[PDB]
Amino acid sequence: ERMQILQNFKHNPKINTIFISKVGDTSFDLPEANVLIQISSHGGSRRQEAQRLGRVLRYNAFFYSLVSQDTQEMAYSTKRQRFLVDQGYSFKVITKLAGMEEEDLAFSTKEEQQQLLQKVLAATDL
Amino acid sequence: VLKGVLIECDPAMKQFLLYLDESNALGKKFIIQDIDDTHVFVIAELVNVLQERVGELMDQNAFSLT
Amino acid sequence: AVIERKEKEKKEKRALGNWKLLAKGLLIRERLKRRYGP
Amino acid sequence: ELTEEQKQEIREAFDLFDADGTGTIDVKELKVAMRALGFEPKKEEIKKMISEIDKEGTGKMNFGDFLTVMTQKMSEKDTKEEILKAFKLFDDDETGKISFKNLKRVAKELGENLTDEELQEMIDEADRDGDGEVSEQEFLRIMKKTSLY
Amino acid sequence: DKKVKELRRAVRSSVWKRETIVHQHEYGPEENLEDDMYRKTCTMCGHELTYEKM
Ligand SMILES: [Ca+2]
Ligand SMILES: [Ca+2]
């Protein structure tokens, strides 16, 4: 299933976006990509972020990292980018997204946002 | 009537102060009146401990490069 | 005789499966009563 | 972990029939000793447990065997109490039997997709006396031979 | 055991709705102090609210 998904990912205009869960953190045969969006990566693995950045290069391309303010993710992202800045890369900070309210997005109202709390607290892995 | 200090900030810090009120992290319930989703009304005699707590929260998740 | 014995064995296997299904159901309901007791 | 204080109660019960300090008590006095600690065994169960304890025909049991038997009896007693509570929850109408309606209602409440034909097959397989349902004793019997608990 | 564990919590996590206790302070009768000072004490958590009434 993974092989066929990755095989049809590149030569298909209908579908051009996939989600990976820590599987692409090694040397695979992933096809050429221009946009990478990482969310909730590992703690402070500079190796993981460097590998993920390596999956894009082959402004031809650009990759984004999404973090949550006032959380440990801020410190994690700060401490895991020190390798790439030594490599010479600079991380521009984006605080506003143009046309955020231009179109409709998920979680537009507070009802589903507060409904998400029950399902995100439903883990209770004890 | 109530006398004190109005504090205006983002809702995140407002709810952080609300949590500090119920958690008794400062020793009492000095967060008396909540007026707006982004504004609070706190007694002024212990603004310094609130500032210290806010600074600790801010620089905790900062990873200072020094 | 072999066919009758096989049919009886199949019936006993069905009975055992039903017993297993009943045990899980009663355990689940008992757990619900324990966690949601008045 | 079996108990901490009830063990002393079993020691006292054993010493009641061992006032002479011989270390063993008569097998015929097993029925009374159980009643001293709250057990209410039946004649068939008493005979069955006497046969197991006295396979060699000695007629006396030491403290270790008596303690093991008492612990097993306590375990079975709490198990039967839980079984009776489960039956009472199943028999929400207090009819004394787990009928077809009760089983179907419980299955629907649990969210199971069990067919009514399987429900009546279960009821028939749960019928030992031929009354058309399952009673307290048959529920106890199946709980005895359950796959796990 | 795994197949009963994976479903025993599905109904466990279904009924509970309100986790946060209602922190609304139900103050009792106000106590009159000097200089027109009035103090209200919460009956649920003991929160004390002192104010001057005009
Ligand atoms: Ca009934
Ligand atoms: Ca019956």
Question: Residues D146, D85: one domain?
Answer: yes
Residues D50 and D88 in one domain: no
Pairing of strands B31-36, B5-8: unpaired
- Of D76, D104, D119, the last residue of a domain is D76
- Same-domain pairing of D98 and D42: no
Tell me whether C26 touches chain E (CB under 8 Å).
Answer: no
* H or E stretch at C19: helix C2-35
> In Å, what is the CA distance from A76 to each residue of A26, A67, A90, B63, E28?
20, 9, 16, 8, 48
CA distances from D37 to A75, D7, D10 (A): 63, 11, 8
For residues D95 and D139, membership in a common domain is answered with yes
Examine the domain organization and report whether D95 and D68 are in the same domain. Answer: no
Best mutation target, E11, E13, E17, to test chain C (most C CBs within 10 A): E11
Number of domains in chain D: 2
How many angstroms separate the alpha carbon of residue E3 from the centre of ligand 1?
Answer: 29
Q: Do D110 and D146 fall into the same domain?
A: yes
Residue numbering of the annotated binding site of D for Ca(2+): 18, 20, 22, 24, 29, 127, 129, 131, 133, 138
Q: Alpha helices of chain B — where are they, by DSSP H? A: 11-23, 47-60
**Is D129 in the same domain as D101?**
yes
The DSSP H or E segment spanning A54 is helix A46-54
Same domain, D71 and D81: no
Q: Are residues D12 and D72 in the same domain?
A: yes
CB pairs under 8 A between A and B: 21
Which ligand approaches the C-alpha of residue D99 most closely? 1
CB-CB contact of E12 with C31 (8 Å): yes
Residue B32 φ then ψ, to 5° = -85, -65
Residue matched to tokens 């309606």: D101
Distance E14 CA to ligand 1 centre (A): 26
Tell me how crowded residue D88 is: count the other CB atoms within 10 A of its CB: 13
Angstrom distances, CA of residue B17 to CA of A113, B49, B57: 22, 12, 11
- Which residues in D lie closer than 8 A to residue C23 (C-beta atoms)? 146-149
Two structure tokens written together for B39: 């504004």
Method: cryo-EM
Q: Output the CA angle A39-A41-A43, nearest 5 degrees.
A: 140
Residue D142 and residue D100 share a domain: yes
| A41 backbone φψ class: left, alpha, beta (φ>0; ψ -120 to 50) | beta
Residue pair D18/D60 in contact (Cβ under 8 Å)? The answer is: no
Quick one: D4 and D36 in the same domain?
A: yes
B41 DSSP 8-state letter: E
> Cβ distance A119 to A112 under 8 Å?
no
Q: How far is CA B56 from CA A9, B62, D42, D64, D126, in A?
A: 46, 10, 71, 62, 66
Question: For residues D140 and D149, what is the distance between their CA atoms, to the nearest angstrom?
Answer: 13
What CA–CA distance (Å, rounded) separates C16 from D146? Answer: 9
User: Which tokens is E51 given?
Assistant: 């104010």
Cα gap D25→D66, rounded to integer Å: 9
Domain that holds residue D39: 1-76
Task: Identify the domain boundary among D54, D76, D98.
Answer: D76
DSSP per-residue string spanning A25-51 = SS-------SEEEEES--SS-HHHHHH
Q: Output the DSSP codes for chain D.
A: ---SSHHHHHHHHHHHS-TT--S-EEGGGHHHHHHHTT----HHHHHHHHHHHTTT---EE-HHHHHHHHHHHHHHHHHHHHHHHHHHHH-TT--SSB-HHHHHHHHHHTT----HHHHHHHHHHT-SSSSSSB-HHHHHHHHHT-S--
- Say yes or no: D90 and D147 in one domain: yes
